[PDB]
Amino acid sequence: MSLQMVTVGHNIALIQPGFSLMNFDGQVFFFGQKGWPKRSCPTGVFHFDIKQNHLKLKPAIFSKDSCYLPPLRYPATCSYKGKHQYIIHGGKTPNNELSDKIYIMSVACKNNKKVTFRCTEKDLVGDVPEPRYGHSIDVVYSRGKSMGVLFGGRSYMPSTQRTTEKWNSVADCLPHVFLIDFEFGCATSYILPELQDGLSFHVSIARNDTVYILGGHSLASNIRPANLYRIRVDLPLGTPAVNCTVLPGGISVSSAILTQTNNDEFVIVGGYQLENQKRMVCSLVSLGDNTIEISEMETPDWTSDIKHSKIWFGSNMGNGTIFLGIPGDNKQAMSEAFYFYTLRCS
């Protein structure tokens, strides 16, 4: 809880609400810039190197057999830390159309602060989930195997009820649970009767056999379910099985950022409480063997700007460090389009 303002280089405008910060061995990489990829950086990815409160967005090449992926804006990013690699699912192509491909980010070659990524296009079969954004995917382990739990987020209307006078309206996807096999890219949808209403922009914490879904926004009624869910999974010799349990003490937040401050101990920072109240309080989530425990922590001191501005975003860098953003006074002495902050958490 040590806030600290940051200064950005020349290509500052690339950072936009919805950016991703992937992480490889303490080396952070910005993804999801604004506008299609330029020619000064053909791929979109960037070394997100912060030193002395100054970050240098540096271009970063791909491999020779990778696949150039568009800059998405609200993907599902899960760290399949098993040959470290990330999984990207869905998002908003700069043409405001949603995507459904899965992308796999590995590192094919590195030499003295010069990385060469490898982004491969994994496609799904079976009960493929809907092209959507705002959702959340997490890799969960069971009985020596792994699987991907994807829980719904909002999307565009289907190709039937999509009129052009409301072409951009969005509906929360049905609250299913998608189990995704990466070894074959196979999807399987399960309708947990305990999950009722649609949910997007939530927070999902995986602990080695479960998924703790928490907070989020429910557009079907414009509320924020303060509940939470524990999706227990188990992988038999044949068809997997899932169960859910509601628990008390759930936060009421959407767009809250997550990072793993300590081993089996997460922090969570402000999303939004009400459409006028940005969330200020920070909450530490003590995981464990079976029992989650959300609690409140030392209310980090927010500067004047952060208490003035009404929207604010960011993501975790990976080592208990949350990078933030603030729009900045429009009617001002040519205030920049975005100011940026960083919060350590030890």
């Binding site: 429009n330 009617k331 001002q332 002495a333 040519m334």
Partner: protein, 94 residues
């Protein structure tokens, strides 16, 4: 709006007023991001704001009389101030 003009066109082309052939229309599409469309309401020259106007222009109308396409209508001043029908307009950088 140009009903009367294209009726006069069919008259001039020695056709029937009461002809309902499949009139093929040829429309032009034009989008141009004009900039600095703001004005100082009070004190402070601060903010420049831009705009975009997507518009079209009915460029020609042609009926397929029998087995030939006759030009029932052609725009006199195609790229003129006052035939570019506005369609959409927004306040946003191009």
């Amino acid at each position: 709006d140009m009903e009367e003009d294209i009726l006069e066109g069919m008259r001039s082309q020695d056709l029937d007023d009461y002809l309902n052939g499949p009139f093929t229309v040829v429309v032009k599409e034009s989008c141009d991001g004009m900039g600095d469309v703001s004005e100082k309401h009070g004190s402070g020259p601060a903010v420049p704001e831009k705009a975009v106007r997507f518009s079209f222009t009915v460029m020609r109308i042609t009926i397929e009389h029998g087995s030939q396409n006759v030009k029932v209508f052609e725009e006199p001043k195609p790229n003129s101030e006052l035939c570019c029908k506005p369609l959409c307009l927004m306040l946003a950088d191009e």
